[PDB]
Amino acid sequence: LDAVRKRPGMYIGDTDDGTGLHHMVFEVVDNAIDKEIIVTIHADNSVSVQDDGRGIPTGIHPEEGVSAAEVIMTVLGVGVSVVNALSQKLELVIQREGKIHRQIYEHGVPQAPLAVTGETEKTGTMVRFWPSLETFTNVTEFEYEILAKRLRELSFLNSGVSIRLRDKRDGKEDHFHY
Numbered sequence: 001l002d003a004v005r006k007r008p009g010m011y012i013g014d015t016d017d018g019t020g021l022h023h024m025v026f027e028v029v030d031n032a033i034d035k036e037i038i039v040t041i042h043a044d045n046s047v048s049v050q051d052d053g054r055g056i057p058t059g060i061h062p063e064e065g066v067s068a069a070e071v072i073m074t075v076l077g078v079g080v081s082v083v084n085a086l087s088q089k090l091e092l093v094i095q096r097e098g099k100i101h102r103q104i105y106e107h108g109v110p111q112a113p114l115a116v117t118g119e120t121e122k123t124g125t126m127v128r129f130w131p132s133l134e135t136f137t138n139v140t141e142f143e144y145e146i147l148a149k150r151l152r153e154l155s156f157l158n159s160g161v162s163i164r165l166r167d168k169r170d171g172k173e174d175h176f177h178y
């Protein structure tokens, strides 16, 4: 990830006008799109993307020797590893094979291995990220309508996916489904 950290604008887009900032969300959503996705803008200016999919794989990657999810998050669509690298904090929650798994990153650095924290009957993946204010300048707050515009376009192209957008700062919400 040091290549990304070294030139963030080249991977995520302009880090001063809000372009790159919002592309962080779009990258995560893109990965989720591969049946309901919920994008939430939190009051602390983090965004979370949840789905009810199968959950990303949690087993150890036989080559890298860490969880497959960690490989996805830390090894170079630009890839969610870019989002992770440029987030001061990122929380990953995977519900899969009857288990809830959690992991925290800071600036792309895992704080511990992906760990089983409980049981569940649901499946899905949740990523919540806090963009690094060391990288993103000037425009540092998410603009609802920038997200809504893109998610609407995506909903038309991905006919079987329901997309919800929620703003916890002011209660605004939308539901894109084609």
Ligand SMILES: Nc1cc(-c2ccccc2)[nH]n1
Binding pocket: 028, 031, 032, 033, 049, 050, 051, 053, 056, 072, 080, 125, 126, 127
């Ligand atoms: N909310 C999410 C994030 C992801 C995801 C899937 C593949 C790679 C990275 C992230 N799925 N659902």
Ligand SMILES: Nc1nc2ccccc2[nH]1
Binding pocket: 005, 106, 107, 109, 134
């Ligand atoms: N604040 C801060 N920024 C960082 C960038 C890379 C690794 C660790 C870091 N801690």
